[PDB]
């Protein structure tokens, strides 16, 4: 009953977006912190994959009325992309599935972490009161 | 209880098996009472063994 949900929706979407453009059919929706407070980097928290016409529709949804306290650290991870671990605690309400409609294939798990590909220096960590924000390319 | 009553048939001379005191109706009972009727039924079926 669970593995069917885990596997089946992706195989169907692979027929629809098997050959389209990855830039046009993609998205990612995480916790945003402004360019200041470096004393922009967002923790992913989800990775959508869907056709272009639905990415256009998801681009305009609110996505901003969801808050959480993100606590960035300075620890490094052995993985290839230079990224620093983090944390997050949602406040108030949890993201209902209705926003990510029945037409997109999202992921059910995710680690909290931020990548630092600019001026490599990890300073002191902090908490920032992040806000959810949709993040796709031009598309 | 069943198996030990069955096994006590052949040690009649050293041990005698009886029905427990607490199986009989309360205060002698009375046949105006359903529970005492069923207690009597259980005793009547169990005694011959």
């Amino acid at each position: 009953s669970l593995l069917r949900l885990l596997i089946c929706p992706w195989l169907h979407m692979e027929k629809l977006i098997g050959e389209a453009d990855p830039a046009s059919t993609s998205a990612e929706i995480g916790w945003h912190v402004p360019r200041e407070q470096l004393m922009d980097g967002f923790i992913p928290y989800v990775s959508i994959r869907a056709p272009r016409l639905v990415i256009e529709e998801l681009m305009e949804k609110n996505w901003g009325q969801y808050h959480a306290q993100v606590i960035v650290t300075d620890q490094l991870v052995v993985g290839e992309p230079r990224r620093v671990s983090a944390k997050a605690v949602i406040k108030g309400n949890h993201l209902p599935v209705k926003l990510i409609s029945r037409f997109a294939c999202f992921t059910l798990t995710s680690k909290y972490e931020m990548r630092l590909p600019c001026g490599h220096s990890t300073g002191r960590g902090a908490a920032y009161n992040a806000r959810l924000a949709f993040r796709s390319d031009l598309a | 209880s069943f198996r030990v009553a069955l096994a006590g048939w052949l040690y009649n001379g050293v041990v005698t098996t009886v029905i427990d005191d607490s199986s009989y109706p309360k205060d002698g009972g009375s046949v105006t009472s359903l529970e005492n009727l069923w207690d009597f039924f259980i005793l009547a079926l169990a005694l011959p063994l």
């Binding site: 306290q69 606590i71 605690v89 406040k91 108030g92 309400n93 209902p96 599935v97 209705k98 908490a127 009161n129 | 005191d21 607490s22 309360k26």
Partner: protein
């Protein structure tokens, strides 16, 4: 000196020396108002305390560490307390408070939290959050009173300035030591001194509406507010209750040790059982004599009928035989340093060897010395300590005793070897018999059960809304409505036109949180379930109700406590008999899916199946589900609505509940928490708890006991007990009576062994019985020893008022209700009558004036119930408090003085040439206006709450709201057809006799208003009330009410003292002894209550049930107006139809109305004469029946004659006799009718015109 020079006249007035008057009253109230706190503590300085009040105070109370080390932060960003000893230390700590405050702008010695800390915490800092949480929680702990302590202390000084009192019964001045032996006052003054020091301001903090301002002194801590509240309570109790000064010292010592420890509430919580454990639970290790009541319980025990049969003398054989309470008590006393106090109590208790008034007074005094504070802690600590408890199930139901699934449910195999089979059988039979009744299948019962839970109180409508939103379903919002937002009325209006398959997703939604503190117990917790979750839990509560009322039938719920529950303890504690006290610790957390809810849901799902095969329940469809209960077969089987609901409710109970915590005392805590604890907000809660309690006890005694014990004694004890003749339970707690056989008290070792068997029984399936067998009764917080009720004075704190939030208090005149409640609580506890009355006089002035002023005359307080002292030049202390409240009480106290009352009037000027039948020639109409009697009498009758006016919402949205609400009420075609046919028949026949005949269409128009007034009042309404009170005070009045006028035509005659109704040597209530003369005489000459005499003319024409939205008044007035005028029966039937009744049922009610001629309902509706509160403990029924005689003493008179067709008048006559007899001090006497001015027929015609005019 100061208080004397201020208000010597008031001291003389309330102390029974000088006649009372309004001028001294209002002048004293002026003195109370124009008066400062520095004046208070200077007056305290004037008191030359003796050495008796002296005591060594620990110096550690003042120097305390900082709050930072007591807190930390969770991995979930939650600021929570760091326990240092045990998982209980989660209360407010004892720390400094000065380094977190900023100076107030006006009062430079007081201040609140610095705004810098609050803003830095709101930004998200760690230390700022911790400091602001500590500050807010300390403020909340200091805000748990009902008024500033200095005001209560001033009232105490006022009352005690008069000195001792003279007893009109004992003929002597009582020996109660003055203030110079009151060590609580001494400790209060010394603490305030040592904290203030050189500073001129004397109050260590000033209680205000918004928040408390701390006195900025380095000698300050957070333990001082509760300590001061304790000391004030102890001082007031010692002065108005006659506690001896040898135990108040021990109480003050324990309070000091509490204030000198790590945290105060935690110490008081660990040390809450040193006085009861060493006095009440250890009395009478050696008897020598004394009397105890001889009650006999009548034979159909289940109905709770008693009979007092005299006092039997005690003997040596009835000495205490329960197990000893020595080692554990000394262990507790040693673990906390309170060993000297424990040894003193344990020694002083062993000197009482006679059941006497003095020993019960000893117990009362020893138990009034425990602190009565409302314990307080952060909400995130309550939710994280209470809701983490889980059942400890040591013998689970085997997995091979469950059939396959039927939807969300599995069934117990009939061949199970567990003990759950008897539970399953009980709930199955209950469900079957409930569903078999034809009453549960009409639309009226469906609608009543629907509307049972649609109230104006919150139901967490938010999470309902945002959970329905998650499946793309809309909901009306009704923008612009003055109605409250978080109310179940609002949810119900939203959820009118919605199919069940849509709203069923909101059954798994989470719940909000509620909080509430108590005396001597951890802060309560609450959860309100929404409308869908309350709907789907109908079969559970219905089956629980059927079990409680028909099958098991061992409970006191739904019965009057003071007529059935008090003498239960009186019987179960009398010496030949014994009592075991059984309680279930953590009852909510012990009811989960793995033992109770699974079995209960399978039972209720199977029992209902027979008589509900295709029908819908309260708006629920007839869904289908496939079953696998039979091996090898798998088939989809239809089910019912009442089974569909059990399916949804089971899928809710399986996962547990998720609580959304968001406390306003710690910034940054709005987490969500998920538990398995059964909720305490469901409709089905309090009934299913008692059902499970009774069921498990009966299965205990019938099955588990005899199968695990071998000695003949315990077997014979468990066979002679049944839950219906030897057990009484209500919800969590319980009581087990053990009758005494002919050989005397039942043996003790056998009872103990049975107790440990019960303790072992609880652990198999989760419960943890807290059993107490020591020779005293315990039920619903009522204590009994040898048949003598013992009031617990620590549970009724005089100054304590609870505030689980930060909201401000209701403005004056909202506090007079609480003051009257304080007086009544003192009344029900048997305090020294003269002292308590005088203190209440002194206290009802200080809360009488406040800002263009508006003052209450004392006559209003006399109207509310407070009894006079010395009015009109009479003798001091003639009136008791048993005088009722209102017109009856006024008539009562007037008629006893009327002759002197008029000769005084004539002796000071007031004279006229008009022979009034009541007051003769004196002109009462001018003097009572002058003396401000009419003013108080008519100002007391005015409400003191802002009547919430409609804010004139828009017509469109209001119409839509009321329409959707009505659609929710009348959902099925049958109710609508009934009401529409009723309206048609009314317009055919009843058109003209009534203009707005009530139906089921005016219910929404009452729910809408009930949503209105749940909001906050506005300044317009406050100013309106102030101006209305001023107006009603500034008139000129000409007479009393018409009812009191008609009353005053009747005279009486006090002839003979009735014979005693109880022995004068038998203690029946501790504190009511010969020292307490008036209550003792009333109790011994009237006798206690052991009868049932409810409803003295509560007759009405409407004898059926309808929705809670409707009112009995409208339907009753309509039926009365339609029966007096004599219309056709079709009109009555049309009214009863459109009020939502069946045809045959409505017509049976019409026949009922046609019987029982309407001369009684009219009087019952015109007059409001009831039995006052204070008479509930006495035997007023026989006083009405036999000892108020309407045939006067020397025969007929031609005036007291009553016409044959006016029988209702005898009722009012018996009223007036009983009230006039109970008002006077001394013993109750035979009162005879004396004379009716006018005549019997004339007075009857006077009442009859009023009855007719309806």
């Amino acid at each position: 000196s100061m208080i004397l020079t201020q208000f010597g006249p008031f001291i003389e007035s309330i102390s029974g020396i000088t006649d009372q008057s309004n001028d001294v009253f209002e002048n004293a109230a002026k003195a109370f108002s124009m008066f400062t706190r520095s004046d208070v503590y200077k007056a305290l300085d004037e008191i030359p305390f003796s050495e008796d009040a002296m005591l060594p105070i620990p110096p550690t109370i003042y120097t305390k560490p900082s709050h930072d080390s007591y807190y930390y932060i969770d991995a979930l960003n939650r600021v929570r307390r760091k326990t240092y000893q045990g998982p209980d230390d989660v209360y407010v700590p004892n720390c400094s408070i000065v380094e977190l405050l900023e100076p107030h702008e006006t009062l430079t010695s007081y201040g609140r939290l610095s705004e810098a800390i609050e803003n830095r915490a709101k930004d998200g800092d760690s230390q700022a959050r911790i400091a602001t949480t500590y500050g807010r929680i300390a403020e909340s702990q200091a805000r748990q009173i009902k008024a500033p302590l200095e005001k209560f202390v001033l009232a105490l000084l006022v009352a005690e300035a008069g000195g001792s009192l003279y007893d009109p019964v004992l003929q002597k001045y009582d020996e109660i030591p003055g203030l110079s032996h009151n060590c609580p006052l001494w400790c209060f003054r010394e603490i305030c001194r040592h904290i203030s020091g050189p500073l001129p301001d004397r109050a260590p903090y000033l209680y205000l509406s918004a928040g408390v301002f701390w006195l900025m002194s380095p000698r300050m801590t957070s333990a001082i507010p509760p300590l001061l509240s304790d000391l004030v309570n102890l001082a007031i109790l010692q002065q108005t209750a006659g506690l001896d000064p040898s135990l108040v010292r021990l109480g003050v010592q324990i309070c000091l040790h509490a204030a000198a420890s790590s945290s105060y509430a935690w110490f008081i919580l660990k040390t809450k059982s040193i006085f009861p454990q060493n006095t009440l639970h250890s009395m009478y290790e050696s008897l020598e004599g004394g009397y105890c009541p001889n009650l006999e319980w009548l034979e159909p025990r289940s109905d709770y009928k008693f009979m007092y049969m005299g006092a039997m003398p005690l003997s040596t054989k009835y000495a205490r035989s329960a197990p000893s309470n020595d080692k554990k008590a000394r262990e507790l006393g040693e673990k906390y340093g309170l060993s000297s106090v424990v040894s003193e109590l344990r020694r002083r208790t062993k000197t009482y060897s006679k059941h006497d008034f003095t020993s019960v007074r000893y117990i009362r005094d020893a138990m009034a010395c425990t602190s009565g504070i409302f314990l307080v802690r952060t909400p995130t600590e309550t939710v994280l300590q209470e809701y983490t408890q889980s059942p400890e199930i040591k013998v689970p139901i085997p997995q091979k005793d469950w059939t396959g699934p039927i939807g969300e449910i599995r069934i117990l195999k009939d061949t199970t070897s567990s003990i759950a089979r008897y539970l399953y059988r009980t709930w199955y039979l209950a469900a079957a018999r409930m569903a078999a009744q034809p009453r549960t299948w009409d639309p009226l019962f469906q609608a009543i059960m629907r509307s049972q839970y649609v109230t104006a109180r919150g139901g967490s409508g938010a999470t309902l809304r945002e959970s329905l939103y998650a499946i793309n379903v809309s909901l009306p919002d009704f923008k612009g409505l003055p109605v409250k937002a978080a109310t179940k009325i609002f949810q119900a209006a939203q959820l009118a036109n919605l199919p069940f398959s849509h709203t069923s997703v909101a059954i798994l939604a989470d719940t909000s949180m509620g909080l509430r503190n108590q005396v001597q117990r951890r802060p309560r917790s609450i959860m309100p379930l929404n409308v869908p979750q309350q709907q789907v839990s109908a079969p559970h509560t219905l089956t629980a109700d059927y079990i409680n009322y028909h099958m098991n039938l061992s409970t006191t719920s739904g019965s009057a406590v003071i007529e059935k529950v008090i003498p239960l303890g009186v019987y179960a504690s009398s010496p030949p008999n014994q009592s075991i006290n059984i309680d279930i610790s953590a009852c909510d957390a012990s009811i989960t899916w793995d033992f109770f809810l699974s079995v209960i849901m399978a039972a209720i799902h199977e029992g209902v199946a027979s008589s509900s095969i295709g029908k819908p329940f309260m708006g629920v469809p007839a869904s289908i589900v496939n079953d696998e209960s039979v091996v090898g077969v798998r088939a989809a089987r239809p089910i019912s609505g009442m089974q569909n609901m059990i399916q949804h409710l089971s899928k809710l109970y399986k996962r547990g509940f998720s609580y959304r915590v968001n406390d306003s005392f710690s910034p940054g805590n709005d987490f969500t928490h998920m538990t398995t604890t059964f909720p305490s907000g469901s409709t089905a809660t309090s009934t299913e708890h008692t059902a499970n309690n009774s069921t498990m006890m009966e299965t205990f005694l019938t099955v588990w006991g005899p199968e695990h014990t071998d000695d003949p004694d315990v077997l014979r004890l468990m066979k002679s007990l049944t839950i219906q003749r030897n057990y009484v339970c209500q919800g969590d707690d319980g009581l087990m009576i053990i009758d005494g056989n002919t050989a005397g008290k039942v043996n003790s070792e056998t009872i103990q062994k049975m107790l440990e068997l019960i303790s072992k029984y609880g652990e198999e399936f989760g419960w943890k019985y807290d059993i107490a067998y020591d020779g005293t009764a315990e039920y619903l917080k009522l204590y009994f020893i040898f048949g003598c009720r013992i009031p617990n004075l620590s549970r009724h704190p005089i100054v304590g008022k609870e505030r689980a939030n930060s909201s401000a208090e209701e403005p004056w005149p909202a506090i007079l209700d609480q003051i009257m409640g304080i007086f009544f609580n003192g009344v029900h506890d048997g305090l020294q009558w003269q002292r308590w009355i005088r203190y209440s006089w002194a206290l009802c002035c200080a809360f009488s004036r406040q800002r263009g002023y508006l003052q209450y005359p004392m006559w209003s307080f006399v109207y509310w119930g407070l009894p006079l002292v010395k009015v009109f030049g009479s003798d001091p202390w003639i009136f008791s408090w048993y005088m009722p409240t209102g017109d009856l009480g006024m008539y009562s106290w007037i008629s006893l003085i009327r002759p002197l009352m008029t000769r005084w009037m004539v002796a000071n000027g007031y004279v006229t040439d008009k022979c009034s039948p009541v007051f003769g020639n004196a002109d009462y109409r001018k003097c009572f206006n002058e003396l401000k009697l009419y003013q108080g009498y008519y100002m007391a009758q005015l409400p003191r709450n802002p009547k919430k006016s409609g804010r004139a919402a828009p017509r469109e949205v209001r119409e839509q709201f009321t329409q959707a609400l009505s659609d929710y009420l009348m959902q099925n075609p049958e109710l609508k057809s009934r009401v529409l046919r009723g309206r048609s028949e009314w317009e055919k026949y009843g058109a003209g006799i009534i203009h707005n005949p009530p139906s089921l269409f005016d219910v929404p128009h009452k729910w809408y208003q009930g949503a209105q007034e749940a909001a906050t009042a506005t300044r317009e309404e406050l100013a309106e009330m102030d101006e209305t009170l001023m107006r009603a005070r500034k008139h000129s009045y000409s007479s009393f009410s018409k009812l009191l006028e008609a009353y005053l035509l009747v005279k009486w005659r006090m002839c003979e003292a009735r014979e005693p109704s109880v022995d004068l040597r038998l203690p029946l209530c501790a504190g009511i002894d010969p020292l307490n003369s008036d209550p003792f005489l009333k109790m011994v000459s009237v006798g206690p209550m052991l009868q049932s005499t409810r409803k003295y003319f509560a007759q009405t024409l409407f004898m059926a049930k309808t929705v809670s939205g409707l009112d009995v008044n409208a339907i009753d007035s309509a039926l009365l107006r339609l029966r007096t005028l004599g219309a056709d029966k079709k009109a009555l039937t049309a009214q009863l139809l459109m009020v939502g009744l069946q045809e045959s049922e409505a017509d049976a009610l019409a026949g009922k109305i046609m019987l029982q001629d309407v001369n009684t309902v009219q009087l019952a509706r015109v007059v409001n004469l009831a039995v006052p509160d204070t008479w509930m403990s006495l035997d007023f029924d026989t006083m009405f029946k036999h000892h108020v005689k309407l045939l006067p003493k020397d025969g007929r008179h031609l005036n007291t004659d009553i016409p044959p067709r006016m029988g209702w008048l005898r009722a009012i006559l018996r009223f007036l006799g009983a009230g006039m007899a109970m008002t006077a001090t001394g013993v109750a006497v035979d009162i005879y009718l004396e004379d009716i001015h006018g005549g019997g027929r004339s007075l009857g015609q006077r009442f009859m015109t009023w009855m007719r005019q309806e």
